[PDB]
Each structure stands twice: as C-alpha cells, then as structure tokens.
Design a binder for this molecule. Sequence first.
Ligand SMILES: Cc1ncc(COP(=O)(O)O)c(C/N=C(\CON)C(=O)O)c1O
Ligand SMILES: Cc1ncc(COP(=O)(O)O)c(C/N=C2\CONC2=O)c1O
Lengths: 275, 276
Amino acid sequence: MNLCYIDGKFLPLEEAKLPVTDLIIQRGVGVFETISTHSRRPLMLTPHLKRLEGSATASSIVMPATLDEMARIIREGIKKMGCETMVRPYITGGDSFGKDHLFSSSRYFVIFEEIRKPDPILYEKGVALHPINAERYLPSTKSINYMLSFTGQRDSKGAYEILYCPEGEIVEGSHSTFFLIKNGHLITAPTSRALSGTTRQIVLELARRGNIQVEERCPLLTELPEAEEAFITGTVKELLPVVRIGDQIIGNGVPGKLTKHLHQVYLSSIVEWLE
Amino acid sequence: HMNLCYIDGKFLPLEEAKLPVTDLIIQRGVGVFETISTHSRRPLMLTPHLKRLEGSATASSIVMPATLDEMARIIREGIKKMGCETMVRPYITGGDSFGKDHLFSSSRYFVIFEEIRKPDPILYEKGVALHPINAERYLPSTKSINYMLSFTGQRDSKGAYEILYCPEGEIVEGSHSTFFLIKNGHLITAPTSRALSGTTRQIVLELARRGNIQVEERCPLLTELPEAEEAFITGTVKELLPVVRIGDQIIGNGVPGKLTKHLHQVYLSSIVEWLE
Ligand SMILES: Cc1ncc(COP(=O)(O)O)c(C/N=C(\CON)C(=O)O)c1O
Ligand SMILES: Cc1ncc(COP(=O)(O)O)c(C/N=C2\CONC2=O)c1O
C-alpha cells in the first residue's frame, strides 16, 4: 500500500494532509525530487538529494531536515513498501516568507508509491511529443510547478508528453531530458536551459564509454527531418524512444538502433549507481 | 475576527484547515484562485472575479467542483461570519488525478477569509521600486497558484516592492499587479493578450474613459521610461500604488504624480458602483 512520511510517522498516502497555510498550496512554493529503485535500491540517491538541496537553496528555502535524515526516511520507506518504489521527497515554503527573504518554517514529506513504468508497448512503438513555445524559468531548480505539463495537453492530440520548444529551440520534455540522434551523434540541450537530469548524466557517461559524440546544444525543430532517432530520459521511464514530435515523424517512425543499444547498456550499467 | 477557511462543507479556523497531499495542487502546482476584497464589508467585483476563476479552471482543463452561485453563497456567508474588512481567496485544486480524457475531474475547492492587510500608508506617500526581469507569465489570462518566481526572485531584486515582467524589454505586468505608465497625461498599459485581465485594471480604464484620459493598450518599453511622468501598479488589495523607480531608472521627479493621486481619489470615491 502507498505511504507518506509526514510529522515523524509513515501514514497511508491517502490519509496524509498539509495545512492550507502552507505557501506550497497558496503560492506554489515547493521543490521535490523523484527517486526510483532497482532491486529495492534507490538509483542516484545522493545526486537526487544534492539536487533537492540545490533546488531549496536556489529558492531561498531553508532545509527543514538534513540529507542524511532524508536518506534514512527514504531507505526505511522502501523497506516498508516491499516492492520497487518511486519516492518523492517534497520541501514546502511553509507558512511565511520572513523579512530576511527566506522560508524558515519549511515543511517536508516523502511519498512512496509502487513504481509505474511506462507500458512495454511504448518502448516497442515509441511515443509522440507535443511541442509548445515555452520554457522552464530557473531550469536547474526542480519546483512543484508542473501545471504547463498538463494544461498544454488540451490540443496535444494524445501526445505522451509536452516538449518545451521556445523560439523553435528544443530544450526538454515536461517530465524528461530530450536527446536527438543525428549522424550517430547525441544532441541534447545544455544545463543552462534544461534540468541536470540524473538519467541525462548517466547517458552522457555511457556515451563517453561507447565513444559516442555528444553535442550540448538545443536541437532545432527544423533539424528534425534530418534526424535518425530521438528519445527522452527520466528516472522512472529510463530511455523512452520518440517517433513523432508534433506532425514531424522521426526517422522511419519506429525506435532506432542507437536508442535501443543505449537502453540495454543503461540497464546493464545502473548497478554502479544503486545506493 | 479570527481567520477562517471553508473546506469540506464547514467553516474552520484557518490554522486547522488541511488538504490531502494526494492533491496535484501540492504535487504538481495544479490550482487556480482569485483574491476578492471588501469595502464596507461588501465584496468588490465578486461576479467578474468568479467568472475569471471559472475561466482559469476551464483554461487549465479543471472541471469546476462547485457552481459559481454556490461559491458566491460560501463567500457572502464567510464575510458575514468575519465581521471586518476581509480578503477572500477561493482556490480550485487539480485534485487527485488527471484522467485519460485529459481533465481534472475530482477537483477540490476551499475559500480562505482573512482580515485585510492594506500596504502601509508610507508606500502610497513615497511610492515603490520595481525590479525588471526578462521573463513572462505563460497563459497570462489564467490566474494559477504559481507565484514561486515572485518570492524566489527577491534574492536579486535589491529590496524592490515587486518584480516587473519585462520580456525582451517590453513591460507586461508585475508579479502581483497590473502596471500603468503615464506619458503626456495619458495612460499606457499592456493589452490582456499579454497580461492578466485585472479587475482593478478594468475599473481604472472605465475611470479614464469617464475622465477623457487616453489609454494606449500596448506594452510600455523600458526604453521609454526616461520620458515618463508617472507610473503605478494596481490590484484588489493595493488599489493604485505609485511606482517611483524601475530598476536603476527614476520615474519622473521620483515622487507620486498628480494623475496617479487623482485616479486613486476617483477610485475610492467611485468604488461603491462595483460592490455586490
Ligand atoms: C523537467 C524534468 N526534466 C527532466 C527530468 C528527468 O530527470 P531525471 O529523473 O533526474 O533523469 C524530470 C523528471 N523525470 C521523472 C520524474 O518526474 N517528476 C521520471 O520519473 O521519469 C523533469 O521533471
Ligand atoms: C500577476 C497579477 N496581475 C495582476 C493582479 C491584479 O489583479 P486584480 O487584483 O486587479 O484582479 C494580480 C493580483 N494582485 C493583487 C491580489 O489582490 N491584491 C493585489 O494587490 C496579480 O497577481
């Protein structure tokens, strides 16, 4: 059964509640991370928790607990779940922004859910993305503000996910890092424009090991017709092939050989980063 | 009076009201709201505010969890319970799931009632400074709960009262306000293609029409600010607040101007026509 750690107790997820005074509710002041398990071990736990601290600090939120304590809560909740888990620690703004311009009464909670991997068919067929002329502001901060990721699916024609394409420059997915494959090179946006993905970080290491050239630049919507493949990355989704962006088919519209090869190396290699 | 929250059919002490962490308002920032203020304990622009709330929900693919008539009912009852000048914020949440039909169909709602906090009289006397940034609100006619930039951005805002969205040097609006420039005795303000359709903004344009004051609905430019005479920002609670500095640029003589003070007096003399 799904759990939420809040106020020192693991609760059934559906019972845990947050006071409406909290500025996460009133004004969207919050940061979080998504951490997944393989063989019940958290992947990239320390990178995730360092990114959580980075997000909080960037947002003038004083940490309401140490990373060691969050690591403690996360391992214990995984053990309590007894299954592969997706774990989201949340840090809230809390009730006030002080005269010192800090949130010094932050609340925290951690959600534990049984992991929901995309359907095997999606890895076989690949997915479609809906491009929109928008961008994440302060992109290295993972805030709770995902509202664009949903509201944009009104005219998204059943797309799996939105793709942020400000001024025709591809930056990242609403929930993912985006990679294009052109003449057997990886192209992906620099961390000035996109979240510093944990999955993104592993894929660049796998590219270094495999002698695959990476260009850290925004791929362009106008380069898509010359691309062979595309995929998106995230801790739960792993590497998910992209076969269509808007009305533009990628390559011959099925997952490509380099995507499938990187996904196999990913699954073989990730033991190195289990904690 | 003590502050209240209407949630799950009951008026509660504000400090006791709690929302389930399953709600995507918490998890994913999926929410919309309005701020409604009172003058003489009557709500100002209640119907426009509630129509804008519904507009925000619908634009965000959120199915309204109550009728506007029901929300109006809850708001009037809470104001009566408060007995004092009140700021009222009805919130519509995404609720627990985004369905396969791409709608939030289990929305929650709640309404916060607080004693009004007007900006300090000194601010109206001296005016305030704004911090310009090269950013924009997306889907600008939707009033979401996402004001996180408005806070986090005050690390680099040098004590500015409020951030000013100035994408590519075009002034659109404040993080919490409509922005007005005054040049040659007429008003300049960004069109509602770019800025929230402010209720205060709407009253000020009607006051301008009544007074024969020209309004240009275009984005004022950072580069025009040296030639400007005055500037002010508008909002439900702040009314008209003079702006004497944007970034390092002084506006006019650096004190509140004659036309700003005139519109504020006509605003307060006229306000009763839009009470409900
Ligand atoms: C805006 C954004 N860009 C990239 C990633 C990928 O970062 P990574 O997970 O560190 O590789 C995510 C999270 N992906 C998620 C979680 O979404 N909150 C996934 O679980 O697939 C994201 O929200
Ligand atoms: C982004 C933004 N634009 C414009 C406005 C003004 O809209 P109005 O209040 O005229 O409908 C506000 C709210 N500003 C507020 C909230 O209520 N009191 C204020 O000063 C706002 O947050």
